[PDB]
Amino acid sequence: AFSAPAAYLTHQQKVLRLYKRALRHLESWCVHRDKYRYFACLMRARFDEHKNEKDMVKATQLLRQAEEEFWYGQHPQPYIFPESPGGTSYERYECYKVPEWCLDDWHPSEKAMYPDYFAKREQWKRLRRESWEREVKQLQEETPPGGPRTEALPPARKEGDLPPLWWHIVTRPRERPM
Amino acid sequence: MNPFASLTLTTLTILTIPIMMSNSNIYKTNLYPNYVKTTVSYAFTLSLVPLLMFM
Amino acid sequence: GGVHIEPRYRQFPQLTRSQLIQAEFFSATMWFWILWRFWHDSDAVLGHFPYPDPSQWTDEELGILPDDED
Amino acid sequence: YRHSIFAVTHVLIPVWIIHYYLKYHVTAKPYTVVERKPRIFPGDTILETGEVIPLMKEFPDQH
Amino acid sequence: SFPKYKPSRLATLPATLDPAEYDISPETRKAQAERLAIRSRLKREYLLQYNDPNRLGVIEDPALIRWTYARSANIYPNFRPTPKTSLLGALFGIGPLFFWYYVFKTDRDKKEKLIQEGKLDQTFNISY
Amino acid sequence: MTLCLGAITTLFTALCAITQNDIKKIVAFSTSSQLGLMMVTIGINQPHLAFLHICMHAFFKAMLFMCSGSIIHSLNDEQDIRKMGGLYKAMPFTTTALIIGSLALTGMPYLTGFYSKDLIIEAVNMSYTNAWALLMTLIATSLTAAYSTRIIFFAFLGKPRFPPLVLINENNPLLINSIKRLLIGSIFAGFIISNNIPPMTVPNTTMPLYMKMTALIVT
Amino acid sequence: SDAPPLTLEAIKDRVLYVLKLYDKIDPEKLSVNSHFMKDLGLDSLDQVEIIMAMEDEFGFEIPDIDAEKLMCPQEIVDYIADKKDVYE
Amino acid sequence: QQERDPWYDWDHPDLRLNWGEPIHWDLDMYIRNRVDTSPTPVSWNTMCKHLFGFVAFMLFMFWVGEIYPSYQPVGPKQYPYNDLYLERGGDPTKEPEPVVHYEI
Amino acid sequence: MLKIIIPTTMLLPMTWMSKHNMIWINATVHSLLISLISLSLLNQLGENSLNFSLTFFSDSLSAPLLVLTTWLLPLMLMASQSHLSKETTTRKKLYITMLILLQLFLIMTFTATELILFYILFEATLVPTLIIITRWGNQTERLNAGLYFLFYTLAGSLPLLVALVYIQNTTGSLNFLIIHYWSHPLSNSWSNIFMWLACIMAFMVKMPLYGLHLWLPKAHVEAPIAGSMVLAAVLLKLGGYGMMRITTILNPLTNYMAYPFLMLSMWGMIMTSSICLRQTDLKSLIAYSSVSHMALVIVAIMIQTPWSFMGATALMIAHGLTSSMLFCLANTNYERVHSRTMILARGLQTLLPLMATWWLVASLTNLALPPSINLIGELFIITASFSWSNITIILMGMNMMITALYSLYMLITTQRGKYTHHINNIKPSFTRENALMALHILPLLLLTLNPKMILGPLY
Amino acid sequence: EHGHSKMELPDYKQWKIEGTPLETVQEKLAARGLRDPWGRNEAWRYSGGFANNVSFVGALLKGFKWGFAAFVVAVGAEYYLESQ
Amino acid sequence: GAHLARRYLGDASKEPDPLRMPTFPPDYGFPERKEREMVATQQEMNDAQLMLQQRDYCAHYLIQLLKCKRDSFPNFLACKHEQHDWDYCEHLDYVKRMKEFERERRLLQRKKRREQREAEMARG
Amino acid sequence: PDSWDKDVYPEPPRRTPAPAPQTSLPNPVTYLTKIFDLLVDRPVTLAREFIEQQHAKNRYYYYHREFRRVPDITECEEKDILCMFEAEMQWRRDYKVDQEIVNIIQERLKACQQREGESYRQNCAKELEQFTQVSKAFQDRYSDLGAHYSARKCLAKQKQRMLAERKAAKEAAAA
């Protein structure tokens, strides 16, 4: 989510992802805590018998057959956290997220209420106004010729500088705005 | 005379009053849910009478 | 609308005597009602009129002639 | 007091309005309100006529 | 020795079951790197156009306009009468019409015959 | 057609419900199974009995959903039963309410559900109808008992399995009063209604002893 | 809900609490800034097991791309706080 | 587009779409609110066979049970007044054939 | 009838003599006054008609259409007030002149005691609409659209004129009263077949009939908001009014000449309802929904039963109102997005809640929710078709389902979901737009109280 | 009014495998040569008020005793009141 | 069920098909032929307007039960003797139906045995 | 009420049983009825009395319109537009009157269905036969004319029906 993706996933990453998926579906299968702990230790052991495999052409055949086994017993109704992309409350509060720029359209009668918040709002707007002009130059000078290769942005390197393209990340509405 | 029809229509019509009041000031306060709950309870109590008459 | 109950973090949550006594009372009334209805109205589960046996009926009442009259 | 005023402005007034509307406008036209005729059982007496309804024929009562 | 998963049109094949996500070659890695590079270029362009405080409008997406034009206003200029196109058009534009015409004509012929001969029990059929 | 549709509906929905893990989905499939049973009742030419079952099902199924919602709210918006553990003692009022509702659902004698479902079973057993539909109805009742057992066992009997931050709380007068009214309903309303309405169908006065207890035995 | 607004101190306390119940880590040697494979000599599988244990502890699951680079208790705390929008 | 990565920071999180990337011809068919081709735990052919086999078996068994119904060892119910001729249809000016019921 | 025609004519000098900053107020106020005056025609009688003079007469089929036409103009003025702000005073006066001329032509067309005058005004309505479409249209395709909107129509109606004069050479008159009283059957002959075709194809093309509807999406998409309003609301009903007026002489030939058109309409309703499901444009979706509803009305007219006529009239009125409101909502969205694409603007109920409510009500009205007059016409036509043939319901039923689908689809894609992040020019809805929405929607819910006002002469 | 009382976390050393079914898991894992490192983290589920469990039949018969006593006293009162 | 199993697994002819019952004259059994007695007349039974399915030989007890329910409304469980009498009369009616079933079954069995004996005698 | 003619819309004598309290337990129905009278019927009755006495001070009448009889289409010339017009209007008025007659019969049938309760199948025979006769006559009169119905089309339908009846009678009588 917050981290930029890479061009490809290494064997280590695929092994870790398979291990996590297997553990999650095992705890979905093994409802109780003691049974899950026993079978998770057993599956970690059976996953550990081939840690020190040296040749890559044989270690890729082990994970390839492990992905054929996981699919067969993958518990077609797994446990999903409520806020996860499959959970029951995934995007429940997504309609309560109102953008900050909407406050620019408030009537002056409504802006009479909450004066300190709006004063801080022009303060933030001015800060962004100078920061963006700095960041355009910083990102233009730091980019390699021909365009970026990965969508990872550099931080701020001077004293008064701010990280390039920061306005829409720090001004997230909230997790539960209302 | 004939309380049965009057009460049977009255429960249905008093189920409708909060819908009309939804444009009033009470809809903008926190007393609206309690208002609707009290309206429903009163409607149930009123409608208990035609059931007794039929029984 | 209730009383102040604190989170526990791996301990048993606080329980007020009111909810426990209310749940126990409601379960007791349920079981008492079941027993009272079973005692006073027991035919609702077992029946009141016995099921007659077709084989016990004699041919006199069933209009059966000894296979010679007709 | 809150329930007292609620029962007047939300129950009593609708009852009055509907009773007036049904008694003096709805029933002013024929067949608007039709009532299923009351059940009649042996031994009953009709208020309009006053004659008694004949009873049953004393069927043999045994258990 | 487990039963094998058979992908279908409406139930595709999982990424972890792809037999092409293992036999990795340097050409595949180069292709992935180029894909990430162009994706990052587009993302950087969008983010530069998105965080600008002087912008007070909609960021025009060439892909969306191109998709709409392709779906709407480009179908005819690339149309060519071919046996497949001709047969499909004739079927989908003629066959249902004659099918429904035949069905309704048969039903109404039966109804009219039953009217003429006289056993249909048209009682209470006042409003038509 | 109505009988066959009701039988297939109740059987399929009960079979789906027996193996689900979301409490709301299981209660929804229970509602669908009850609707299928009522459609079977319509198919065997007993409309008034179907209406009676509507009236009782309203009470106890509404209270079952209310208890499920109380559990979900007290458990930080969690619906899956794999993360529901020991709630028999941690939150007792909802436990006893759901136990009463499940007993009423399964047609336990002299409850709101017995006075309708028991008559449904007796009527469907003594009717010149489809035998396959009768078998499907019996299996559906057994499966109803089975997933009620599943709900109770997986939500109230085992050790706790939720996140360590315990926030269980039932001490709110609105919840308690709303649940208790439906408790009183699901306990007494069946008897009151059955004894307070005029008879609208002929009774099955005589009954084979095994056939009389068939619903209880299968449950 | 009536859920209290968890703070940075609470998050750090819960993170350390989960870490200390993991007997493979010495309770008297672990610190908030302790690294996993360097300061504690752990393995990647142990790292993902800690990630999942914290996932169950806090009731939300971290994506793998973000989980595979959370290497210190302090940055795990900071990630959770950023996810939950914690003020102080 | 339901099976796209839900954890990547898309420019259109609801649609799982990115700014600039070529849009699929049938995008409006695949908008997470319509048909999705996400892989299933069970193969499509096996699900199809199981579903239609279950439906066909249920229909066939319903037909079989219709052929072989279930009833009780009883005769038909008897109604006194000429099988309720007057109360079922009426027509009192025909005087139908009387039916008498055999008391046993 | 002159008490309404004369004020419509006097609207032109008042507009041309008004101040450069007061034309809209005068036009709106006097158009509303004219609509109030025209409300008097709604008092129809079960007897023959309101025969004002030898040239103009009013019936209970013409009266609701006249009232709707008079009521439409203020709504069009309010809708066009926005996008004509930077327009010169002379060109704004020309636009208002075109609108007033179109209303005058429609008003004279809907009375039209004589058939040749009816045809002349029927084609006179074509010029101001073409000028509006081709002149004040934003996109480059408008010209082509205008061409289509012209030629199709003329291709339909040029034979009709000949047929018309031919009738007057045989019958001797084209007055609708004399035509109705002196009606004689058409024998089964090739000449009568071609006369039937000439009379019917003129009004089939403008309704439009499936297969002749290609001009309609172009004309509605490329026209300005007022043009879309007048095309969807009133200009589509000219074909239905003409068919109900002219089918009095085509019997009994229609009993077997309506089969191709009945089949075409009953399949084109399904085809266009399915087309609405996959559309990348809001205006095209609304246009195809209009095509489906008009195909249903064509089916009703071809059935030729009293319930068919009642349902056809009610459906025409309700569809005109609903389509006008939907086009207004789409234009309000477009004026902020400037793209006219369904998926670019999303999650608008978070930003504009009252506009979301208006969208919901318009979608429900299009979805034919009881007890709206939309469903009154729908059910009347459905029952009439069922009497015509018990199988038609199947098709009809499918259409209904599909209708609801795309309607809610239009409601869900545009209003529900997450808002588009890079669109920050969504200003709060003006009082003008909300007033326009209310003036569109309140007459529908008030007419559902008194359906007989729009049920036609066969009520 | 909210629940702000500064709740403190309990001591982490009280959580033990003893008296829990995790003992059996540890024995079965050691019989093969393995250990479960996360055993104590789930000890709280078997330590406090969650230590005692109830059977399904015991759960069903929640208020059997009080209901039976009420039924007995009611039937006794009915017997002693009718006989007069 | 036993009858269903015997009919669907043995011979169908020996046991009746409940749709066509009865298949033998009522006077075949005994000649006295006592008729069933109804105590509820046309007019009173119509006035009670019970139900078409409730207008059977058990009508008088149902009428009495309805009358006692109407008379003592507030205490609904007041009249239980009348309900028991109606239930007993329905039970007797069902027993009569079962007796008819068994009588028809035994008449058919006797007819089959007589036909078999006649065929065996004629064969020789 | 004397507002409508009792003969056009008949009702039975409406006999009701007398109360027969078996026990001494006071029912809630009678108490609720009495209290409902007390605080509902009295204010409504007073308001109606006030409105009626206000109405009596201003009494004025409205009249039912009577229409003279005009020659029918059967005695109208082929091209006499005025006589054809008058006959057409008279036929339309008669058609509306026939529709309202059918409406009255349907209302009586529905009232019988509701009032008779469970025995509606037996006690509503007369109304059913009346409705059947009226519906058959109305279908013979006006059915299948079409949207563009007229006096001439109905006359042609009647002439065709009479021709068919005459042919059938001539065939049967001479047989």
Ligand SMILES: CCCCCCCCCCCCCCCCC[C@@H](O)O[C@H](CO[C@H](O)CCCCCCCCCCCCCCC)COP(=O)(O)OCC[N+](C)(C)C
């Ligand atoms: C494209 C978008 C829609 C536009 C409109 C489409 C609808 C137009 C169709 C017009 C109605 C049908 C045309 C002809 C109807 C005549 C009746 C015919 O169909 O029935 C048979 C007639 O058979 C044949 O149709 C005869 C004519 C055959 C030659 C005509 C060409 C047919 C196909 C042409 C398709 C071209 C369509 C596009 C035109 C530009 C029965 O034969 P018969 O009972 O003995 O004679 C009937 C006529 N009588 C009684 C006067 C003597």
Ligand SMILES: CCCCCCCC/C=C\CCCCCCCC(=O)O[C@H](COC(=O)CCCCCCC/C=C/CCCCCCCC)COP(=O)(O)OCCN
């Ligand atoms: C959007 C495109 C639509 C285009 C129009 C489609 C309809 C075209 C129908 C024909 C148009 C002209 C019809 C003539 C008008 C009626 C006049 C009439 O009926 O008089 C006939 C004349 O009949 C004709 O002349 C008809 C000849 C047709 C000539 C033009 C042919 C146009 C194309 C014909 C095929 C199209 C039909 C289907 C079109 C489908 C829609 C595209 C009798 O003449 P008399 O000599 O007086 O009597 C004979 C006994 N003494």
Ligand SMILES: CCCCCCCCCCCC(=O)SCCNC(=O)CCNC(=O)[C@H](O)C(C)(C)COP(=O)(O)O
């Ligand atoms: C209920 C569903 C059940 C699903 C079962 C699925 C199958 C389970 C059995 C899997 C079989 C295998 O082990 S398949 C074995 C795959 N091949 C290898 O593991 C060789 C090299 N391993 C690595 O490099 C790793 O990264 C490692 C060194 C381990 C850690 O690295 P770190 O130090 O950087 O953490």
